[PDB]
Write a protein that binds this ligand. Structure first.
Ligand code: HEM
Length: 399
């Protein structure tokens, strides 16, 4: 629907998709705990930073879908549709992350910088010198999935096929295409595991197979494929939009772009602001209420679905002073863009690394980069959990 009073802004419909921020601010001020009638049913939205951050660590906001279901029917059901950690609660979540963390290390993420810088340069060389091009499809879409390929150790021949299948999930609409692309990804990854079981290498897939703890416990076929699938889902579309929204932020702010060109080393700090200013994960994945929770005088009953407004919260003036202004020189301190608590983005370090390499190399390579269309001529994807551009037409300019 829409907001109410003073002046009303569209929600998850119409004008919302071009700029959801005026709508986000109205909610924060007038209506911060709101049951929203969506296509996929009724979900609650928390928009105030303080509530969002609290909700993240509150155990009463569970990742278990069974909390919607009555008492006597929960014994029947699995805790998860697939054994992914983002859908799991403690202590099951604790064991899974502990075991994957033995392979998906901050070191391994950081070790990819040379391989990341290669992928970026390869696409930059493949972009035209003269004339307009689509920066989303021809650059922004391509970096993350190829980083994910290097991570998992997907064969070089099949990398372009892998890239295409994942892009169908990122893409706007068709559902059957999204359901079948999942199918041949899940097929390819499961197939790949067994090939790495007899021919191992230095890549993450082969690394995850051999993982043990103190007790001698490991990962089975189910969990390994589910982790592979999650790494791709949670790390492709999300990273694409950090690159996308971040480049947009610079092109639509001539002052800040001057600051970065005159001082390239600001890029690490710049990424941090792009994540706060225009958060690619607009709302966090669904949480379910185990018991009744109260926020801003509104009680969400037990069994309801809750989304945490990350993009909204990151512009709360109670947290951040002058929060609508883009300042790359800022100090992040507690941006809920990577989440907060037990579920905090497990690939967050890879995400920042890809963020600085993609955005930093591009503006170095193409200093006279410009938008090819007006800001109101830009089209965003109409998806709940994402803020992101379907296309970004840019002129590369001379030199
Ligand atoms: C800048 C881009 C990214 C953003 C904004 C982002 C955001 C998030 C957020 C908000 C969560 C928590 C979801 C929740 O609490 O419901 C999350 C979880 C996760 N992200 Fe990311 N992410 C990004 C990139 C990546 C990358 C590159 C990877 C690695 C391939 C990754 C892997 C994960 C995983 C595995 C989780 C689940 C952690 C857990 O629950 O134990 N993400 N991400």
């Amino acid at each position: 629907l829409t907001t109410t009073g003073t002046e009303q802004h569209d929600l998850f419909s119409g004008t919302f998709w071009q700029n959801p921020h005026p709508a986000y601010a109205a909610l924060r001020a007038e209506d911060p705990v709101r049951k929203l009638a969506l296509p996929d049913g009724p979900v609650w939205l928390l928009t105030r930073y303080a509530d969002v951050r609290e909700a993240f660590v509150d155990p009463r906001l569970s990742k278990d879908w069974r909390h919607t279901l009555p008492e006597d029917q929960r014994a029947d059901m699995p805790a998860t549709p697939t054994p992914m950690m983002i859908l799991m609660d403690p202590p099951d979540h604790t064991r899974l992350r502990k075991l994957v963390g033995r392979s998906f290390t901050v070191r391994r993420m950081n070790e990819l910088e040379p391989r990341i810088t290669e992928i970026a340069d390869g696409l930059l060389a493949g972009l035209p010198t003269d004339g307009p091009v689509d920066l989303m499809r021809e650059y922004a879409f391509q970096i993350p999935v190829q980083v994910i390929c290097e991570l998992l150790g997907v064969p070089a021949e099949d990398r372009d096929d892998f890239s295409a299948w994942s892009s169908v999930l990122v893409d706007d609409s068709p559902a059957d295409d999204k359901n079948a692309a999942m199918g041949k990804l899940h097929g390819y990854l499961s197939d790949l595991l067994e090939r790495k079981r007899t021919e191992p290498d230095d890549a993450l897939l082969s690394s995850l197979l051999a993982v043990s703890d103190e007790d001698g416990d490991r990962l089975s076929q189910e969990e390994l494929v589910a982790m592979a699938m999650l790494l791709l889902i949670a790390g492709h579309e999300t990273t694409v939009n950090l690159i996308g929204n971040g480049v947009l932020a610079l092109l639509t702010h001539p002052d800040q772009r001057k600051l970065l060109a005159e001082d390239p080393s600001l890029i690490s700090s710049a990424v941090e602001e792009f994540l706060r200013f225009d958060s690619p994960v607009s709302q966090a994945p669904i949480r379910f209420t185990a018991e009744d929770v109260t926020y801003s005088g509104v009680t969400i009953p037990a069994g309801e679905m809750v989304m945490l407004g990350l993009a909204a919260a990151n512009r709360d003036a109670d947290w951040m002073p002058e929060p609508d202004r883009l300042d790359i020189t800022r100090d992040a301190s507690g941006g809920v863009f990577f989440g907060h608590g037990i579920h905090f983005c497990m690939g967050a370090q890879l995400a920042r690394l890809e963020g600085r390499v993609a955005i930093g190399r591009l503006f170095a390579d193409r200093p006279e980069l410009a938008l090819a269309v007006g800001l109101d001529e830009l089209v965003y994807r109409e998806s709940t959990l994402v803020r992101g551009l379907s296309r970004m037409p840019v002129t590369m300019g001379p030199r």
